[PDB]
Design a binder for this molecule. Structure first.
Ligand SMILES: N[C@@H](CCC(=O)N[C@@H](CSCc1ccc([N+](=O)[O-])cc1)C(=O)NCC(=O)O)C(=O)O
Ligand SMILES: N[C@@H](CCC(=O)N[C@@H](CSCc1ccc([N+](=O)[O-])cc1)C(=O)NCC(=O)O)C(=O)O
Lengths: 209, 209
């Protein structure tokens, strides 16, 4: 530390890492970048891939939301207890990222014409996570092993935004329903999710959610 | 170990991990899955995300190409020397993945109509990697630090397949050109790139490259 998140005034690819920091009792600074400021062209060319989020942890400056999550995982001991768990956590997180990519593409490029096919195809994309939960202490612990990891925060966010997109998408996925309920109920996440910083921030950069 | 790769008969998302294993002096088995076998629908339901590659390292079964690369990185000491390097390697690999994703979309969905725009947009996506190299011992070493990492193999593969897509795309990226040449010249990679199993394998699954 200190921690700084440099991002658009949205939840997007930062709410997972924000929930992570909150739940871990870490404080951080938000450097909010408007599109107006972004369109000025001063910051964009200094970013590695010309994109946000950008994250600072003391002397370490990072880009790529999942690299940031993995760094937080390794540094804060949220990357499982062993080599198997670390690999399985990567496998989970890559799955989360696949579906997030499909979600982002829908929201920003094809919402009106593509939502119906998306929500229709969604249960097939959520089943893997229910399956993962089913094979880990009957879904009563975390996505991998018995301790919270970076992969949990990301999957939790993915499930949260998808409930907004499709209200009852988790009714046919009991383990994922209770999982969302259980992790959201953790005191520090509970507090974060009800905080003005979170509540008064749109999920995405357009209207669409 | 033992190592087993379960995949379709293409280079695709497995050539990087193959070059990794080859370069590290590791042997592995190929379990080639044909469209016919996939269609018969016994293996697909058992795969976590209904997709390949599937990877076995002794008792550990994995899906997700990048999770496999990260696992090989962690277990074979190809994940840098410290926290900073590990995070920067993740930042590089995620960038490689982003571009590979765009590549896959071009190849498999919009090759003819989209190739023109893809190639004109390509230099903007290659520049970050040239910049990284220029800032790491003047491009004389690896993408991050002075030892080969899982990120190098993934980047190397991505660059190679783009040299097929756009013959001269590295002309204006001299450090990447030399980087490709130098890594390709590593005896075990040089050997692997000539080997019939690689040479006889098509880059993609639809016969487009
Ligand atoms: N692979 C990268 C993807 C990063 C990314 O897509 N960043 C978007 C913002 S996240 C999605 C997003 C986009 C826009 C807004 N907004 O409010 O304007 C909010 C969120 C961006 O920087 N766009 C600016 C640009 O490319 O020039 C990662 O995981 O970090
Ligand atoms: N995020 C995953 C992506 C893997 C993936 O996309 N797998 C696909 C493509 S394999 C490479 C491939 C693509 C297309 C053909 N083809 O026939 O044209 C052949 C092989 C797959 O298994 N598809 C089977 C399915 O979904 O049922 C990863 O990184 O491993």
């Amino acid at each position: 530390p200190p921690y700084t998140i440099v991002y658009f005034p949205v939840r997007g690819r930062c709410e997972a890492m924000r929930m992570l920091l909150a739940d871990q009792g870490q404080s951080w600074k938000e450097e909010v970048v408007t599109i107006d400021t972004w369109m000025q062209g001063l910051l964009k060319p200094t970013a590695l891939y010309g994109q946000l989020p950008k994250f600072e942890d003391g002397d370490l400056t990072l880009y790529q939301s999942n690299a940031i999550l993995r760094h937080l995982g390794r540094s804060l001991g949220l990357y499982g207890k062993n080599q198997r768990e670390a690999a399985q956590m990567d496998m989970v997180n890559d799955g989360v990222e696949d579906l997030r990519g499909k979600y982002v593409t829908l929201i920003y490029t094809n919402y009106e014409n593509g939502k119906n096919d998306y929500v229709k195809a969604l249960p097939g994309h959520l089943k893997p996570f229910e399956t993962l939960l089913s094979q880990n202490q009957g879904g009563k612990a975390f996505i991998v092993g018995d301790q919270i990891s970076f992969a949990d925060y990301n999957l939790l966010d993915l499930l949260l935004i998808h409930q907004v997109l499709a209200p009852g998408c988790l009714d046919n996925f009991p383990l994922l329903s209770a999982y969302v309920a259980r992790l959201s109920a953790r005191p520090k996440i509970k507090a974060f999710l009800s905080s003005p910083e979170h509540v008064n921030r749109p999920i995405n950069g357009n209207g669409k959610q």
